[PDB]
Design a protein around this ligand. Structure first.
Ligand SMILES: C#Cc1ccc(C#Cc2cn([C@H]3CC[C@@H](COP(=O)(O)OP(=O)(O)OP(=O)(O)O)O3)c(=O)nc2N)cc1
Ligand SMILES: [Ca+2]
Ligand SMILES: [Mg+2]
Ligand SMILES: [Mg+2]
Ligand SMILES: [Mg+2]
Length: 539
DNA sequence: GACCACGGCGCC
DNA sequence: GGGCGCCGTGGTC
């Protein structure tokens, strides 16, 4: 390409190099742009950023987040990564996409700009004719990238002092558990080392080994195994409590306060748009989609996520989302009728499980039923189910027979989906997002059946994901107009931040936008909560 | 230091 | 059953 002075003309593709992957923390090392056979290199990247009207190129959202951090309103535009991910969601990295669609991902900004330009041309070509994928790109993925940039740059407030204090408390409890374990083992060892623990449990205390690990065939010390052995020796429950506390301390309590940004005073995650096989987003550095909520200590951590003073959090959650999506995709009259009547399958299964009418099913019972309903729907074996519910095998095989007896068109949909997957090589969501599943015709049963369960799950999980992304795209401009902010997405949950005086109005509006995002054969229902912290806002 | 595989486990 | 990302260990370079 011909070397030309900065700045580039409008519509140019950008290339950039960062000192590290996280754009909120990165130094912008180099910046360049490519258009019309020319490459333009920025003499000073930060100042040069002000010359761009949009970020158009590979990883555009990352550059946009960095620009927002610097107080510039530079939105992301076209990004070849999003095109490639739509063609085939195994396209997740710039390295892989480059090699596959016509270049090499290097560490030089000018080369990255030229690459962005060539790849976009190539991928745009592959998408011609693909009307549904083009719709997803134009109506969902491309504008969602702008919404995600704002969310990343905004971050979320965390009560640092509270977490520091909590760390000290938890450390003391860990010491008490550790001391007791060692006493019961008759010697100290590294309780964090599963290899060392395996030897104490199975070789020294002589407990029965229940299971083996996948890759290396060691005797497993997983929670499922320890639960099975909690009556066999008092050390086992102490180990389970130790695991719970150290997992929470090492993963959340200790790292989180160190990730507060000096400029914002907030915690900033990355929302990865081309990371999953199904079209869900992921969250990383730190992952904020797996913040604890189950246990008492988990709930105390969830309370550390708070609104700015004078604001409130608003938490929105689609109810029974995958079952509702399944009803639409399958067209099963019975399942459809369940939701038109206002019924709850989780509650109804929890009635069966715990032996309760339908009334007085506490929230905890309902949640236990979730794993059962999802597990069974997606192909959990009758043996795992019998083991989970502590019931005879024949009662489990019967339970699954009844599950699919109640909604006969679900099986037919599953069969239909698997056949198209075998014939075409991919399966699709309601909106045409695809996932290629080559192992559907594998001659090894375990491999083939694993592929089947991935294949028929994808349209359900991915349709739910598409619906939430669409909702986020629709909701974002409405929030801006009300001075509210979108903070986090957790798959089928959204967390917003609103001025206290407008939080009620924000919640009502957000609920309506999410419920009416794309009408299905059954109503979408959204539960909404308001509070000073994440836990309080989820009621 | 960084990277890796693994087992294990947090949430959806 | 499906989908993720991060931890510490043990190991390497
Ligand atoms: C305690 C506890 C506890 C906490 C979490 C779970 C859990 C869980 C799982 C979730 N998923 C997928 C499908 C539905 C979507 C949104 O997960 P979720 O909101 O919980 O499902 P829902 O919308 O039907 O439940 P509702 O909002 O009405 O209370 O995420 C899944 O495939 N497998 C799971 N095990 C089970 C128990
Ligand atoms: Ca939900
Ligand atoms: Mg939820
Ligand atoms: Mg792994
Ligand atoms: Mg080490």
């Amino acid at each position: 390409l011909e070397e030309a002075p900065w700045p580039p003309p409008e519509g140019a593709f950008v290339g950039f190099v960062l000192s590290r992957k996280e754009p909120m923390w990165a130094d912008l090392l180099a910046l360049a742009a490519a258009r019309g056979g020319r490459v333009h290199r920025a003499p000073e990247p930060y100042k040069a950023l002000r010359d761009l009207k949009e970020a158009r190129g590979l990883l555009a959202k990352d550059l946009s987040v960095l620009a927002l951090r610097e107080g510039l309103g530079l939105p992301p535009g076209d990004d070849p990564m999003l095109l490639a991910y739509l063609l085939d969601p195994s396209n997740t990295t710039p390295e892989g996409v480059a090699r596959r669609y016509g270049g090499e991902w290097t560490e030089e900004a000018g080369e990255r700009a030229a690459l962005s330009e060539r790849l976009f041309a190539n991928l745009w070509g592959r998408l011609e004719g693909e009307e549904r994928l083009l719709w997803l790109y134009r109506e969902v993925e491309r504008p969602l990238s702008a919404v995600l940039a704002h969310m990343e740059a905004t971050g979320v407030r965390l009560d640092v002092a509270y977490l520091r204090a909590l760390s000290l408390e938890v450390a003391e409890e860990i010491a008490r558990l550790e001391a007791e374990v060692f006493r019961l083992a008759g010697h100290p060892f590294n309780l964090n080392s599963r290899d060392q623990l395996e030897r104490v449990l199975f070789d020294e205390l002589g407990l029965p080994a229940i299971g083996k690990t996948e890759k290396t065939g060691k005797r497993s010390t997983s929670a499922a195994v320890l639960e099975a052995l909690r009556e066999a020796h008092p050390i086992v429950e102490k180990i389970l409590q130790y695991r719970e506390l150290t997992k929470l301390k090492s993963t959340y309590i200790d790292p989180l306060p160190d990730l507060i940004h000096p400029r914002t005073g907030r915690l900033h995650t990355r929302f990865n748009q081309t990371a999953t096989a199904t079209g869900r987003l992921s969250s990383s550095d730190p992952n904020l989609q797996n913040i604890p909520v189950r246990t008492p200590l988990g709930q105390r951590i969830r309370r550390a996520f708070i609104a700015e003073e004078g604001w409130l959090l608003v938490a929105l959650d689609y109810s029974q989302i995958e079952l509702r999506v399944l009803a639409h995709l399958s067209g099963d009259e019975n399942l459809i009728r369940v939701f038109q009547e206002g019924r709850d399958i989780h509650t109804e299964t929890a009635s069966w499980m715990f032996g309760v009418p339908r009334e007085a099913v506490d929230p905890l019972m309902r949640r236990a039923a979730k794993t059962i309903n999802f597990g069974v729907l997606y192909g959990m074996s009758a043996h795992r189910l019998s083991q989970e519910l502590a019931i005879p095998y024949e009662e489990a095989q019967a339970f699954i027979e009844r599950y699919f007896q109640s909604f006969p068109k679900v099986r037919a949909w599953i069969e239909k989906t698997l056949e198209e997957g075998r014939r075409r090589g991919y399966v699709e969501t309601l909106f045409g997002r695809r996932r290629y599943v080559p192992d559907l015709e594998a001659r090894v049963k375990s491999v083939r059946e694993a592929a089947e369960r991935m294949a028929f799950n994808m349209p359900v999980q991915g349709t739910a994901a598409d619906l939430m992304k669409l909702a986020m795209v629709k909701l974002f401009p409405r929030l801006e107009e009300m001075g509210a902010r979108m903070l986090l997405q957790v798959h089928d949950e959204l967390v917003l931040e609103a001025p206290k005086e407008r939080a009620e109005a924000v919640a009502r509006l957000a609920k309506e936008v999410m419920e009416g995002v794309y009408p299905l054969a059954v109503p979408l229902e959204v539960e909404v909560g308001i509070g000073e912290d994440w836990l309080s806002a989820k009621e």
